Design an enzyme around this catalytic site. Sequence first.
Site, mmCIF file in Angstrom:
data_model
loop_
_atom_site.group_PDB
_atom_site.id
_atom_site.type_symbol
_atom_site.label_atom_id
_atom_site.label_comp_id
_atom_site.label_asym_id
_atom_site.label_seq_id
_atom_site.Cartn_x
_atom_site.Cartn_y
_atom_site.Cartn_z
ATOM 1 N N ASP A 140 -13.807 82.850 46.815
ATOM 2 C CA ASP A 140 -13.912 84.096 45.864
ATOM 3 C C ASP A 140 -12.725 84.680 45.492
ATOM 4 O O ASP A 140 -12.814 86.115 45.028
ATOM 5 C CB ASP A 140 -14.862 85.292 46.819
ATOM 6 C CG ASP A 140 -14.325 85.421 48.119
ATOM 7 O OD1 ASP A 140 -13.222 85.383 48.157
ATOM 8 O OD2 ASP A 140 -15.199 85.709 48.974
ATOM 9 N N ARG B 291 -10.091 89.452 43.041
ATOM 10 C CA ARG B 291 -11.379 89.122 44.231
ATOM 11 C C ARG B 291 -12.818 89.236 43.490
ATOM 12 O O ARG B 291 -12.730 90.366 42.855
ATOM 13 C CB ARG B 291 -11.311 90.360 45.274
ATOM 14 C CG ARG B 291 -12.454 90.194 46.481
ATOM 15 C CD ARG B 291 -12.547 88.836 47.032
ATOM 16 N NE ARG B 291 -13.324 88.890 48.505
ATOM 17 C CZ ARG B 291 -14.496 89.036 48.314
ATOM 18 N NH1 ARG B 291 -15.229 88.888 47.154
ATOM 19 N NH2 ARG B 291 -15.576 88.999 49.402
ATOM 20 N N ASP C 201 -19.537 87.124 48.525
ATOM 21 C CA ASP C 201 -18.654 86.856 49.600
ATOM 22 C C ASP C 201 -18.861 85.336 49.877
ATOM 23 O O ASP C 201 -19.766 84.916 50.535
ATOM 24 C CB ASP C 201 -19.147 87.691 50.995
ATOM 25 C CG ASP C 201 -17.997 87.544 51.836
ATOM 26 O OD1 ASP C 201 -17.170 87.359 51.768
ATOM 27 O OD2 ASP C 201 -18.552 87.465 52.958
ATOM 28 N N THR C 202 -17.930 84.404 49.602
ATOM 29 C CA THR C 202 -17.889 83.156 50.140
ATOM 30 C C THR C 202 -17.424 82.794 51.532
ATOM 31 O O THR C 202 -16.607 83.643 52.028
ATOM 32 C CB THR C 202 -16.829 82.186 49.259
ATOM 33 O OG1 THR C 202 -15.501 82.868 49.037
ATOM 34 C CG2 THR C 202 -17.586 81.989 47.714
ATOM 35 N N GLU D 235 -14.753 81.830 54.578
ATOM 36 C CA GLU D 235 -13.300 81.518 54.314
ATOM 37 C C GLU D 235 -13.307 80.002 54.452
ATOM 38 O O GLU D 235 -14.174 79.243 54.936
ATOM 39 C CB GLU D 235 -12.843 82.188 55.500
ATOM 40 C CG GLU D 235 -12.916 83.832 55.734
ATOM 41 C CD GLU D 235 -12.090 84.417 54.535
ATOM 42 O OE1 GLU D 235 -11.140 83.872 54.111
ATOM 43 O OE2 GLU D 235 -12.578 85.705 54.143
ATOM 44 N N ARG E 264 -5.972 93.728 45.114
ATOM 45 C CA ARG E 264 -6.517 92.763 44.381
ATOM 46 C C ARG E 264 -7.349 93.371 43.526
ATOM 47 O O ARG E 264 -7.844 94.350 43.399
ATOM 48 C CB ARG E 264 -7.404 91.740 45.059
ATOM 49 C CG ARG E 264 -6.672 91.023 46.515
ATOM 50 C CD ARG E 264 -7.725 90.330 47.477
ATOM 51 N NE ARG E 264 -8.742 91.305 48.093
ATOM 52 C CZ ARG E 264 -9.627 90.800 48.794
ATOM 53 N NH1 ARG E 264 -9.521 89.621 49.119
ATOM 54 N NH2 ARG E 264 -10.619 91.930 49.528
HETATM 55 C C1 LIG Z 1 -15.299 92.523 47.100
HETATM 56 C C2 LIG Z 1 -14.693 93.909 47.613
HETATM 57 C C3 LIG Z 1 -13.894 93.779 48.590
HETATM 58 N N1 LIG Z 1 -13.410 94.844 49.209
HETATM 59 C C4 LIG Z 1 -12.435 94.909 50.556
HETATM 60 C C5 LIG Z 1 -13.637 95.281 51.485
HETATM 61 C C6 LIG Z 1 -13.154 94.327 52.657
HETATM 62 O O1 LIG Z 1 -12.265 95.426 53.605
HETATM 63 P P1 LIG Z 1 -11.867 94.597 54.841
HETATM 64 O O2 LIG Z 1 -10.656 93.668 54.806
HETATM 65 O O3 LIG Z 1 -10.996 95.798 55.834
HETATM 66 O O4 LIG Z 1 -13.072 93.719 55.664
HETATM 67 C C7 LIG Z 1 -12.476 93.015 52.229
HETATM 68 C C8 LIG Z 1 -13.287 91.910 52.079
HETATM 69 O O5 LIG Z 1 -12.681 91.043 51.174
HETATM 70 P P2 LIG Z 1 -12.503 89.399 51.680
HETATM 71 O O6 LIG Z 1 -13.896 88.979 52.039
HETATM 72 O O7 LIG Z 1 -11.733 88.751 50.843
HETATM 73 O O8 LIG Z 1 -11.920 89.502 53.131
HETATM 74 O O9 LIG Z 1 -12.311 93.513 50.785
HETATM 75 C C9 LIG Z 1 -13.330 96.065 48.599
HETATM 76 O O10 LIG Z 1 -12.943 97.141 49.087
HETATM 77 N N2 LIG Z 1 -14.115 96.078 47.370
HETATM 78 C C10 LIG Z 1 -14.764 95.044 46.904
HETATM 79 O O11 LIG Z 1 -15.531 95.120 46.203
HETATM 80 CA CA LIG Z 2 -14.555 85.840 51.579
#
Ligand SMILES: Cc1cn([C@H]2C[C@H](OP(=O)(O)O)[C@@H](COP(=O)(O)O)O2)c(=O)[nH]c1=O
Ligand SMILES: [Ca+2]
EC number: 3.1.31.1
Length: 129
Positions: free
Chosen positions: A15, A29, A34-35, A37, A75
Amino acid sequence: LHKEPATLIKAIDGDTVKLMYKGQPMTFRLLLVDTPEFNEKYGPEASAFTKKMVENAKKIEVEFDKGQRTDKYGRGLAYIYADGKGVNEALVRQGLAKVAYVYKGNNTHEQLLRKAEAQAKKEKLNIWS
Ligand SMILES: Cc1cn([C@H]2C[C@H](OP(=O)(O)O)[C@@H](COP(=O)(O)O)O2)c(=O)[nH]c1=O
Ligand SMILES: [Ca+2]
């Protein structure tokens, strides 16, 4: 919403992807998904699927939703398309991502992706197996 140009720089995982957008390198992103890891179950399959989709594409487009366009990690947050096909939706449709991270005001394609997830769950695909 509207589609804008970008070019692949490099695949990263299920993702995330590195694209050139308005001439600058950015990690994107994928909204609303959510894929796993890489190190988790279906992680490798998710990465491979996104990789193949973006690497094979003649034309990559990015589409921002109505709300924040960058997350707290810098991102880019977008829907990404490969030869006009939604990557976000394709991953959910194949049971390689879950609909997730649905924040108010960046959720234009929420219902389209939930319909995809329902079909993948019905078919018991991958994550839903
Ligand atoms: C997809 C997305 C993720 N995020 C942030 C939330 C999560 O914060 P945290 O890192 O504090 O958990 C993280 C999840 O992304 P990842 O799944 O790539 O790890 O990315 C956003 O803020 N907005 C979004 O739309
Ligand atoms: Ca992920």
